[PDB]
Design a binder for this molecule. Structure first.
Ligand SMILES: CCCCCCCCCCCCCCCCCC(=O)OC[C@H](COP(=O)([O-])OCC(O)COP(=O)([O-])OC[C@@H](COC(=O)CCCCCCCCCCCCCCCCC)OC(=O)CCCCCCCCCCCCCCCCC)OC(=O)CCCCCCCCCCCCCCCCC
Ligand SMILES: CCCCCCCCCCCCCCCCCC(=O)OC[C@H](COP(=O)([O-])OCC(O)COP(=O)([O-])OC[C@@H](COC(=O)CCCCCCCCCCCCCCCCC)OC(=O)CCCCCCCCCCCCCCCCC)OC(=O)CCCCCCCCCCCCCCCCC
Ligand SMILES: CCCCCCCCCCCCCCCCCC(=O)OC[C@H](COP(=O)([O-])OCC(O)COP(=O)([O-])OC[C@@H](COC(=O)CCCCCCCCCCCCCCCCC)OC(=O)CCCCCCCCCCCCCCCCC)OC(=O)CCCCCCCCCCCCCCCCC
Ligand SMILES: CCCCCCCCCCCCCCCCCC(=O)OC[C@H](COP(=O)(O)OCCN)OC(=O)CCCCCCCCCCCCCCCCC
Ligand SMILES: CCCCCCCCCCCCCCCCCC(=O)OC[C@H](COP(=O)(O)OCCN)OC(=O)CCCCCCCCCCCCCCCCC
Ligand SMILES: CCCCCCCCCCCCCCCCCC(=O)OC[C@H](COP(=O)(O)OCCN)OC(=O)CCCCCCCCCCCCCCCCC
Ligand code: HEM
Ligand code: HEM
Lengths: 70, 386, 483, 117, 445
């Protein structure tokens, strides 16, 4: 494990010469749009089987319950 | 440079601590998902301290275990806080370990260099499972006693020595005082073995370096660990503290089972014997295929697959951020694991057993599809080359 | 905008150039690969190995004359090989062999000292001499028509040599001035392996014993060790066997006649290998040089060819070697890949009743432990796991080395003399090849189990050897516990 | 391969488009994802690669890591000028693998072995 | 359970012995129409040596390369277009052969040694390696690093350093290019430079494939499908070198060396023989037969003590010659050693100072040295290659022997006078702050 060198020029500003928490709640609609658009497939795949399986189980249990109602 | 003394961190008394906790170079682009290892270490330390302070008021006897627990709750000043911290922190320790494991699965933090890190993590997972099981048996509640009985009855699955092994582990012909004392001693012993395993885990990772969300070779842009990743870890610790206080002071027994507050009655049995919520995926894998030796073999196969995950080859692209198919497979795996855990807390009726059978198949299909995808995608650059 | 063209940036241009080079390198040519094969296999050389008949004649006095006649050659090499050396002489006379070698060309009853050199130079041939621990050689390379003169000179210096006190003193001064790190390592290894044995003592001998020799010990040593049965006249090149025999009969008549023989001397004082180790730590030399050796096999041992193949498998590697990392021998491959040793070489030595087989290495003080581990690991793989491919490669290499070492009339004569003194006969090339081919993986494993498996070692190290592993380490690594 | 060619397969074409979009955001080529610590054949190939190419790869990796740390992507112009899948390592990696394969076939010893962790 | 080595091993299919007087074979030369000279001769020993030689070297080198010959010698039998370095060495070791590469100012060669059985393998490997080598950058860099190390530890042999200094100082042109690359030239050397040098210089007319123990028919049958398809590039004009003389003085005892230039080299065959015989007569030193009774040994070495080494050297190139004396003495007596060497050089020039017996001994020593040197297969193949590269054919040894017979006192004195007339070249290395000036030493001749 050894550090590799890269020719670069780095300009950095003091932490007390710039705003700290103002950049958090900035461009929030754009950030939310990126989160939604870049991850909608992943959210569908994560919550797809869960919701469909829950609905199927609920339907099966309801069908059995009314079937055994005498 | 060594002629006269310099910064005391570089001195031999603090040299190793400095090199491994302050000046250790880590990638600068690590997300908040990398604080879960330190958070799990904090949870383990919390469990050790809280258990050490609970063992001063706990008597491992069948006629005194539940009464001692209630004495801790009521008579001991702050004992209710102590036991709630212990139980809910075991729950959060398993939560953060699950997040740790799944983040590693997503970012392929195991593939070529951290195979030993992943193997040590699997050993740590086994140790945590055993320790949590024995600790849950310790209060000697109805659910604790019957879960201990059932899970030890799984040991009667080896065709030759299963009965001998289960009888020797029970300390007799049934779960009784001998089993309680045995489990108390083991539950005290294992967390220190867990500490040793965690130290080996950290050292093995520090041999090569932490993976990054990009999965790329990260040595050109690295920063010292202390000034930049202690504050991020502090943010993670404070958020976890808020979550932990929420689950202790307002919903203490939500994660627990109500039947554990009934004194253990060997004659009677609860209508539904279910382990703790964090053993539910393993229990569902057990009960998916109908058998006992088959279920034990399935659990062993699960652990063998976890151990053999890092040893697959041709996984040149590490991070799942640059693998759409693998990202979809991982998200399907996470959904499958959640569904399996939910199934583990359900009866053995027809839809539940069918879904459990399907879920385990998907779980192993993840461990096959990953090598298949790696081998298929090894030839990506020649095909998309422009 | 648009992506830059592949011939716009420096890195893109370099990548394109190297990709083009790799593409042009990718395609092979079958016409340039039809015959060659990188996997060694046994081959038949019966037709190739045709050599002139080596005629050997035994005179009634016990003298042996061997000739390899080749009338096409314009030169020839005529020499005398004597079964004598540092071993067959007592402690009180240790430098006598070397001193006699130095005095053999310094004066005689008729050719004098400067007159002999003038005659040799006018003849144009070179008259050389050398004494080993068990063999002595005085040989002259001369043109075809000068063979009788060379034989007469050899007979004169062997029989009618007279030593003067002034010349003895001058040669003693020269020897003291003369008194090679590899040579000193080998001498120390021989001493520490054959302590309390004539092979242990060095050829040069102690300085006091060298100075205490004058005109009597030399004559006694000649009369004792230069008898007719122990001398072989080897002639190679443009020599006629009948003429050589007739001239030897005419000339060599005043030879010493003693009942002592090399076999009787060896039986009286045999050679015993004592496992031991000597370390000369100096740290002022940049390189550390150490040799490790085992029991080994004698000249008349059927496993001598197996030891030759074994040391061929162990191999030799040098920093200037063309092969580098890419070589047949596993030890050489490991050394070249890891850059641990400056120069490694497996050496096999054979004597009348024992030998020395091992590895001599030169390396930096930092890599000594790794080099020693590699040496021991390969030497123990040599008994535990042997590959048929490696055995075939080593057999081919040994055959090639033995045949390429011939390369001239003087080495032909040297081979004839040495093989006679060692065996009683000159092994033909076809029989030697059959002996080499009879060695396979099973034979190598058996011989290595006989000689290396859990056997005492002789270690001789010099230099910055503070990192070298010790004798117990070497002795335990001599065997494997996994098998 | 038939199904892996974007021309003959629509699924492969969409996968290639998504991969190009993902790589161009951080401005690093596909071969930059290869880890020298992974196979050590990548390590040997990068050792044999020219210094200019290695330096450019390291600069691209540093830029990608900095962008990931800043939680931002390359601007639109640089994303347009980004050219992923312009290979620089595949040929030398294949050559190293072929040399290793022939060395293994003809007995031999590995020129380098991954240290046991 | 094989028998002991004393006892013959059972039953063998050993062949019948060769006759005592096998007919010595004459060299056979065939010119492939692109201009490539394939030569062979038959030898009775089972060992065959095959070399392949070219007119390349420092003389044909350009100022761009300055070390290409040395690096090609180091980059010999490396990875080629058809097979890699591992395959090269494995093929070499499978048959047990040995490879070698020699680089000189005028001509450089690649030699291969193995049994007579593996003739096709030797020819194939040599032709492949010479014709189409792949100058890989990593291999070139490794060889460059090795040459850096060698130059960093090059002072251990001052004789080669002095010879290189003499060749660099007494010449100005093609022959002045050093055989060892300097630091800057080594740094700027690389794979493309080597490939361009080989492509522009390894042209068909300048290859001689010589065989020492290979039948001509087999060698031709193996080498025709491998060298016939080669461009017929005309031979470039021989690079020109002019002699100017000079002095080289380096500080690092002290080792001095004087030298001159006899006009005409190997092409002036009789004068080359006279130069070799004169060098043998000079001899030198630092058992009997190693020039112990040479003139320098008799009059300079043993007579005058404190002289560590004193010998004579020569170097003969195509249409060029160089002869001189290398000395290595204590720094206190360097000027007197230089004066003694000058006096010896003048004494040889003056007629009547060489005994007839001494010259007869020198002739006998030269004849014996040549005869015993050409007794090796490698030397035989090298002689074939060099002779064909120089004269276009392998001159019979009888011509050389007859020239050595024909040399005489008048001829040797005339050649010494021609040696003296040429401008003096000097090279001194070591404690060189007490040696005499170049002008002062030159005024003695
Ligand atoms: C319709 C479709 C809707 C799709 C919505 C997708 C979405 O919102 O994704 C958010 C987000 C993905 O957004 P991203 O920025 O593209 O990815 C995160 C970056 O990789 C890395 O970005 P990051 O690391 O900067 O932030 C990721 C996240 C990381 O948050 C966590 O690690 C906490 C997870 C709690 C569960 O951090 C935060 O949210 C910032 C505050 C973190 C405070 C510290 C928390 C430590 C743990 C506390 C105890 C938890 C128990 O999802 C996740 O991080 C995973 C959510 C859980 C999945 C299981
Ligand atoms: C004397 C030596 C001074 C020295 O050189 O110190 C080195 C160094 C001082 O560096 P410096 O540059 O000289 O000073 C300026 C720095 O910025 C350092 O100054 P600072 O401004 O960073 O100080 C911050 C410090 C301030 O701390 C204090 O003031 C506490 C005293 O914060 C902490 O110690 C973090 C506390 C986190 C609590 C997490 C709780 C998790 C949940 C637990 C269960 C909750 C249930 C409800 O000190 C540190 O780096 C402090 C590290 C603190 C780590 C705390 C980890 C706690 C984990 C507990 C787990 C087990 C809990 C069982 C119950
Ligand atoms: C332990 C860590 C090392 C494990 C072994 C690794 C290894 O390769 O060893 C062989 C290796 C051989 O040396 P090498 O340099 O690798 O050379 C290789 C040989 O040429 C060739 O080596 P080799 O082929 O002879 O060795 C192969 C080795 C390889 O071993 C294995 O593969 C073992 C696999 C697991 C077997 C489990 C049963 O297998 C064996 O030796 C056969 C063992 C068979 C019995 C196994 C145990 C049965 C128990 C019932 O190292 C040693 O033999 C050295 C062992 C050193 C042990 C030191 C113990 C110190 C104890 C101190 C006590 C007091 C401390 C202070 C107390 C108070 C503190 C406050
Ligand atoms: C009464 C509240 C008075 C607040 C005064 C300051 C308000 C302010 O400016 O907050 C902004 C600040 C972030 O500052 P920044 O974004 O860098 O700069 C913007 C200004 N140019 O925002 C912040 O600093 C908010 C985040 C930090 C809040 C820390 C609160 C600590 C309270 C401890 C109580 C302990 C009780 C026991
Ligand atoms: C009460 C105790 C409660 C439990 C405490 C924690 C227990 C941890 C158990 C495992 C400890 C393992 C050792 C950790 C320290 C270590 O490894 O120190 C190594 C170092 C060796 O010396 P040094 O020359 O500095 O070498 C490193 C630089 N080459 O060593 C040193 O320099 C000396 C270190 C002394 C101790 C420092 C703390
Ligand atoms: C109790 C058990 C709990 C198990 C929890 C498992 C959590 C696993 C986390 C794995 C890492 C992860 O999710 O990372 C965020 C992921 C990818 O984001 P990333 O590739 O870093 O960035 C995109 C470009 N900025 O992006 C996403 O996760 C986006 C989709 C989130 C869907 C939430 C519903
Ligand atoms: C050596 C340190 C430890 C000691 C002495 C200890 C001791 C105890 C005791 C006495 C109890 C029963 C008291 C009660 O639950 O109110 C208990 C419960 C428990 N322990 Fe531990 N423990 C230790 C570490 C751990 C660790 C590391 C874990 C997690 C792996 C763990 C998991 C549990 C669990 C899940 C329970 C059940 C809590 C409940 O619902 O009643 N313990 N432990
Ligand atoms: C006792 C519970 C555990 C603790 C205290 C723990 C602690 C840590 C720590 C401190 C790190 C380094 C910081 C980091 O990279 O996040 C780490 C990394 C890691 N852990 Fe764990 N760990 C635990 C359980 C596990 C488990 C069960 C696994 C699964 C095999 C695992 C796999 C890993 C991996 C792969 C890394 C490398 C992270 C990366 O490079 O991306 N850990 N762990």
């Amino acid at each position: 494990k050894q550090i590799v060198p890269v020719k670069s020029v780095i300009y950095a500003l003091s932490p007390f010469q710039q705003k700290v928490m103002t950049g958090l709640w900035k461009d929030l609609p754009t950030k939310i749009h990126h989160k939604v658009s870049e991850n909608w497939i992943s959210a569908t795949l994560l919550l797809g089987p869960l919701v469909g399986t829950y609905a199927y189980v609920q339907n099966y249990l309801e069908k059995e319950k009314l079937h055994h109602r005498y | 440079i060594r002629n006269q003394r310099f910064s005391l961190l570089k001195e031999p008394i603090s040299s190793t601590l400095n090199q491994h906790l302050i000046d250790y170079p880590t990638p600068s682009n690590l997300s908040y998902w990398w604080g879960f290892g330190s958070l799990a270490g904090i949870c383990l330390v919390i469990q050790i301290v809280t258990g050490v302070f609970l063992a001063m008021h706990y008597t491992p006897h069948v006629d005194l275990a539940f009464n001692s627990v209630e004495h801790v709750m009521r008579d001991v000043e702050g004992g209710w806080l102590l036991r709630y911290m212990h139980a809910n922190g075991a729950s959060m320790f398993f939560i953060v370990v699950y997040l740790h494991i799944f983040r590693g699965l997503y970012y392929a933090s195991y593939s070529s260099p951290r195979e030993f890190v992943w193997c040590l993590g699997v050993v740590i997972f086994l140790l945590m499972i055993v320790t949590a099981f024995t600790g849950y048996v310790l209060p000697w509640g109805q659910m604790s006693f019957w879960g201990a009985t059932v899970i030890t009855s799984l040991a009667s699955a080896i065709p030759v020595v299963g009965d001998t092994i289960v009888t020797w582990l029970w300390g007799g012909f049934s779960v009784d005082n001998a089993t309680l004392n045995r489990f108390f001693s083991l539950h005290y012993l294992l967390p220190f073995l867990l500490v040793g395993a965690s130290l080996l885990h950290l050292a093995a990772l520090h041999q090569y370096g932490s993976n990054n969300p990009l999965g790329v070779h990260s040595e050109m842009d690295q920063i010292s660990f202390y000034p930049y990743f202690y504050v991020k870890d502090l943010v993670g610790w404070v958020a976890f503290a808020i979550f932990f206080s929420i689950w202790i002071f307002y919903a203490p027994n939500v994660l627990g089972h109500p039947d554990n507050y009934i004194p253990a009655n060997p004659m009677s049995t609860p209508p539904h014997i279910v382990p703790e919520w964090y053993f539910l995926p393993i229990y569902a894998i057990l009960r998916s295929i109908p058998d006992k030796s088959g279920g034990v073999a399935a659990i062993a196969l699960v652990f063998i697959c976890l151990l053999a995950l890092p040893f697959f080859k041709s996984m040149y692209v590490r991070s799942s951020s640059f693998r759409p198919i693998y990202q979809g497979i991982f998200w399907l795996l996470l959904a499958d694991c959640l569904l399996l855990g939910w199934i583990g807390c359900q009866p053995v009726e027809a839809p539940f057993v069918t879904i459990g059978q399907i879920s385990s198949f998907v779980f192993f299909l993840f461990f096959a599809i990953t090598p298949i995808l790696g081998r298929v995608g090894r030839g990506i650059p020649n095909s998309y080359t422009t | 905008p648009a992506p830059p063209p592949p011939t716009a940036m420096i890195y893109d241009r370099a990548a394109e150039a190297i990709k083009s080079k790799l593409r042009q390198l990718e395609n092979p040519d079958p016409r340039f690969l039809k015959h060659g094969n990188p996997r060694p296999a046994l081959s038949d050389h019966t037709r190739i190995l045709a050599a002139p008949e080596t005629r050997v004649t035994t005179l009634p006095n016990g003298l042996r004359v061997a000739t390899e006649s080749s009338l096409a050659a314009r030169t020839a090499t005529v020499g005398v090989w004597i079964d004598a050396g540092s071993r067959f002489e007592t402690e009180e006379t240790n430098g006598t062999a070397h001193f006699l070698e130095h005095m053999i060309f310094k004066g005689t009853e008729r050719r004098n000292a400067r007159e002999l050199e003038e005659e040799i130079e006018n003849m144009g041939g070179h008259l050389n001499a050398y004494t080993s621990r068990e063999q002595t050689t005085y040989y002259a390379k001369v043109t075809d028509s000068d063979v009788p003169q060379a034989l007469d000179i050899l007979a004169d210096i062997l029989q009618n040599s007279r030593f003067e006190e002034n010349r003895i003193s001058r040669e003693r001064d020269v020897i003291l001035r003369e008194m090679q790190t590899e040579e000193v390592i080998f001498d120390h290894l021989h001493a520490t392996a054959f302590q309390y044995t004539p092979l242990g003592r060095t050829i040069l001998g102690p300085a006091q014993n060298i100075k205490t020799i004058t005109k009597a010990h030399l004559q006694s040593y000649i009369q004792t060790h230069y008898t007719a049965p122990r001398m072989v006249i080897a002639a190679s090149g443009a020599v006629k066997h009948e003429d050589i025999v007739e001239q030897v009969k005419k000339l060599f008549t005043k030879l010493s006649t003693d009942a002592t023989t090399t076999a009787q001397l060896v039986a009286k004082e045999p050679a015993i290998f004592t496992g031991s180790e000597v370390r000369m730590l100096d740290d002022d030399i940049p390189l550390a040089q150490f040799a490790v050796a085992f029991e080994g096999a004698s000249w008349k041992d059927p496993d001598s060819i197996a030891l030759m193949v074994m040391q061929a498998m162990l191999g030799s590697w040098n920093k200037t070697a063309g092969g580098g990392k890419h070589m047949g021998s596993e030890l050489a491959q490991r050394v070249g890949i890891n850059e641990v040793a400056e120069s490694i070489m497996a050496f096999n030595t054979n004597y009348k009743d024992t030998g020395l087989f091992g590895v001599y290495a030169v390396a930096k003080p930092d890599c000594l432990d790794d080099l020693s581990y590699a040496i021991m690991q390969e030497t123990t793989k040599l008994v535990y796991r042997v590959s048929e491919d490696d055995v075939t490669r080593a057999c081919n290499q040994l055959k090639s080395s033995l045949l390429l070492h011939i390369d001239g009339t003087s080495p032909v004569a040297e081979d004839i003399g040495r093989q006679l003194l060692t065996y009683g006969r000159r092994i033909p090339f076809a029989e030697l090849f059959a002996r080499i081919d009879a060695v396979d993986a099973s034979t190598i494993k058996r011989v290595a189990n006989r000689f290396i498996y859990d056997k005492d070692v002789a270690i001789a190290a010099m230099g910055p050897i503070q990192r070298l592993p010790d004798y117990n380490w070497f002795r335990r690594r001599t065997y494997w516990n996994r098998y | 391969q038939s199904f892996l060619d974007p021309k003959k397969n629509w699924l492969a074409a969409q996968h290639m488009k998504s991969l190009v979009k993902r790589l161009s955001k951080y401005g690093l080529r596909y071969d930059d994802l290869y880890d020298p610590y992974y196979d050590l054949d990548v390590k040997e190939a990068l050792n044999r690669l020219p210094k200019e190419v290695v330096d450019a790869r390291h600069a691209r990796l540093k830029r990608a890591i900095d962008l990931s740390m800043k939680h931002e992507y390359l601007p639109e112009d640089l994303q347009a000028m980004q050219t992923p899948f312009r290979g620089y390592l595949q040929d030398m990696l294949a050559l190293v693998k072929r040399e290793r394969a022939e060395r293994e076939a003809l007995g031999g010893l590995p020129l380098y072995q991954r240290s046991i962790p | 359970s094989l028998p002991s080595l004393d006892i013959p091993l059972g039953g063998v299919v050993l062949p019948d012995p060769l006759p005592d007087s096998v007919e010595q074979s004459k060299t056979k030369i065939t010119t492939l129409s692109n201009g490539l000279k394939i030569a062979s001769e038959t030898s009775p020993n089972p060992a065959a040596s095959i070399g392949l030689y070219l007119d390349c070297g420092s003389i044909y080198e350009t100022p761009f390369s300055s070390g290409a010959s040395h690096l090609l010698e180091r980059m010999a039998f490396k990875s080629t277009t058809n097979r890699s370095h591992f395959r090269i060495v494995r093929e070499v070791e499978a048959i047990g052969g040995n490879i070698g590469a020699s680089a000189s100012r005028e001509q450089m060669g690649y030699t291969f040694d193995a049994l007579k059985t593996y003739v096709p393998q030797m020819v194939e490997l040599l032709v492949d390696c010479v014709r189409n080598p792949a100058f890989l950058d990593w291999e070139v860099n490794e060889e460059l690093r090795k040459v850096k190390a060698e130059l960093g530890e090059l002072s251990n042999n001052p004789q080669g350093l002095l010879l290189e200094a003499i060749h660099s100082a007494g010449y100005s042109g093609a022959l002045a290019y050093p055989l060892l690359a300097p630091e800057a030239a080594l740094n700027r050397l690389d794979g493309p430079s080597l490939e361009e040098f080989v492509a522009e210089n390894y042209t068909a007319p300048r290859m001689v494939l010589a065989a020492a123990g290979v039948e001509h028919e087999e060698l031709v049958s193996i080498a025709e499908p491998l060298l016939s398809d080669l461009p017929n590039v005309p031979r470039p004009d021989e690079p020109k070198s002019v002699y100017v003389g000079g002095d080289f003085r380096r500080h690092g005892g002290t080792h001095v060396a004087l030298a001159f230039e006899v006009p005409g080299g190997w092409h002036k065959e009789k004068d080359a023989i006279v130069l070799t015989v004169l060098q043998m007569l000079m001899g030198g030193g630092g058992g009997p037969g190693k020039g112990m009774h040479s003139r320098l040994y008799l009059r300079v070495l043993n007579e005058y003590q404190q002289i560590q080494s004193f010998s004579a050297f020569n170097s003969i190139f195509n249409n060029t010659g160089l002869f001189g004396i290398y000395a290595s003495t204590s720094p206190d007596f360097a000027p007197k050693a230089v004066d003694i060497a000058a006096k010896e050089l003048i004494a040889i020039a003056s007629p009547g100072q060489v005994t007839q017996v001494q010259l007869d001994r020198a002739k006998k020593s030269t004849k014996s040295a040549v005869l015993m040197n050409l007794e090796s297969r490698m030397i035989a193949s090298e002689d074939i290659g060099r002779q064909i590269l120089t004269y276009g054919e392998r001159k019979p040894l009888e011509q050389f022997l007859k020239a050595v017979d024909e040399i005489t006192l008048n001829d040797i004195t005339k050649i010494s006078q021609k040696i003296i007339s040429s401008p003096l070249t000097m090279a001194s290395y070591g404690d060189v702050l007490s040696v005499p000036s170049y002008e002062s030493v030159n005024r003695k001749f």
